[PDB]
């Protein structure tokens, strides 16, 4: 059915410009004007502008004139927004939403723009092992530490999308190094700690790091009677 597929996480430098794409699918692209909206801070949604996909006529939020530029390419069914002269206050999540009669009825997955002078770094991944210290009766908690990466975001899935229930992936935190660090956990029937394999799939797009980490029960020295 209807999907708007956006270009992925961008890590860019101050003073340069980013081009973000938005591919319309499942419908006739030229039918519907495309919007762009900025989500910064936590909550602040801002309208940037509209491009009519049929004519190419765009009109802007006066707060974004100069800074924002929109083009549409009917053959790839893709809408483009260019943000120029980037500063750190352009770091945000940008959405495309198609207009379907004075309403922005379907939105894209959003594109994470990070304005920084740093290079990317890919995460280290370490197991959070199950044991007696992580069993509360039939259920064992286990997980993965995704450490020392930049920029956001990383995605974590379990067993390649098959283990979904009991999974918590926490907000990243910022270490002293300036590098992000997050944890992903899943609670699991402990009956299955031997018979069933547990693998976490960490995907850091801006560094092109994929890691699939086997989480086994840790080496452990047992009491002596």
């Amino acid at each position: 059915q209807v999907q708007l597929q956006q270009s992925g996480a961008e890590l860019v430098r101050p003073g340069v410009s980013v081009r973000i794409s938005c591919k319309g699918s499942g419908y006739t692209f030229t039918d519907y004007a495309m919007h762009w909206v900025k989500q910064s801070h936590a909550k602040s949604l801002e309208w940037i502008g509209v491009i009519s996909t049929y004519s190419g006529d765009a009109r802007f939020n006066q707060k974004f004139t100069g800074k924002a530029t929109m083009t549409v390419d009917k053959s790839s069914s893709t809408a483009y927004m260019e943000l120029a002269r980037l500063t750190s206050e352009d770091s945000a999540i940008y959405y495309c939403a198609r207009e379907v009669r004075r309403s922005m009825d379907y939105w894209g997955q959003g594109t994470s723009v990070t304005v920084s002078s740093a290079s990317t770094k890919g995460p280290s991944v370490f197991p959070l092992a199950p044991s007696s210290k992580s069993t509360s009766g039939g259920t064992a908690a286990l997980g993965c530490l995704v450490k020392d990466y930049f920029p956001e975001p990383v995605t974590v899935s379990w067993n390649s999308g098959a283990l979904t229930s009991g999974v918590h992936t926490f907000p990243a935190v910022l270490q002293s190094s300036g590098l992000y660090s997050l944890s992903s956990v899943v609670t699991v029937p402990s009956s299955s700690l031997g018979t069933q394999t547990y693998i976490c799939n960490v995907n850091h797009k801006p560094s092109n790091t994929k890691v699939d980490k086997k989480v086994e029960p840790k080496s452990c020295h047992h009491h002596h009677h």
Binding site: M104, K147, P171
Partner: protein, 214 residues
């Protein structure tokens, strides 16, 4: 520019109850108001266009009301998955503007965390650092004190927590606290303890290990 004021950053409600989220416009936007729902780490989904009209794949428990200036999104029979931010928006004249958002918080019965503590993996220990993780799984309400003790000595300034948003099914929160220390500092101490304070606990719960031992 048209201002769209949502006066409540926070509404609290119970599964099965009725909530009304208000949205006020600085002038007559004559019915051209949309409501959007944004669940944790998702994009907004359109719930209602033109004040009262419901978009597709949208349940009948969401209704829209309002004329001239004052607008209202009503959720009859609130459900656990209705946890989300709610934004109004005027589509009357450019520039289109949104309200400041309203976070719907869902009330549920107290629940105590299940507490797990995770030593550093032997392989991070190789790379120079010991990250000790303590997991608080599925608790309600949000407030939670996590205190680290290394050889019964209280820690400060060297841990970091983060908290998930209410889970879509059970309305619980989860938290991880990470104690970061150099490998050298790690191996001078035996007892690593995570002590958890929460309303659903009779008394603080301590999870602990002795370094290197089961």
């Amino acid at each position: 520019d048209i201002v769209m004021t949502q006066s409540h950053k926070f509404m609290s409600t119970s599964v099965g109850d009725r909530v009304s989220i208000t949205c006020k416009a600085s002038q007559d936007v004559s019915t051209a108001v949309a409501w959007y729902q944004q669940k944790p780490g998702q994009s907004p989904k359109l719930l209602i266009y033109w004040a009262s009209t419901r978009h597709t794949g949208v349940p009948d428990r969401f209704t829209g009301s309002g004329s001239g200036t004052d607008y209202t999104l009503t959720i009859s029979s609130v459900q656990a998955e209705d946890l989300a931010l709610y934004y109004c928006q005027q589509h009357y004249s450019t520039p289109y503007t949104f309200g400041g958002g309203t976070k719907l918080e869902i009330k549920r019965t107290v629940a105590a965390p299940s507490v797990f503590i995770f030593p550093p993996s032997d392989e991070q220990l190789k790379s120079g650092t010991a990250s000790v993780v303590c997991l608080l799984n599925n608790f309600y309400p949000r407030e939670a004190k996590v205190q680290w003790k290394v050889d019964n000595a209280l820690q400060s300034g060297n841990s970091q927590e983060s908290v998930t948003e209410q889970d879509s099914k059970d309305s619980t929160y989860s938290l991880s606290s990470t104690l970061t220390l150099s490998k050298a500092d790690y191996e001078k101490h035996k007892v690593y303890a995570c002590e958890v304070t929460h309303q659903g606990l009779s008394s603080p719960v301590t999870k602990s290990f002795n370094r290197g031992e089961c």
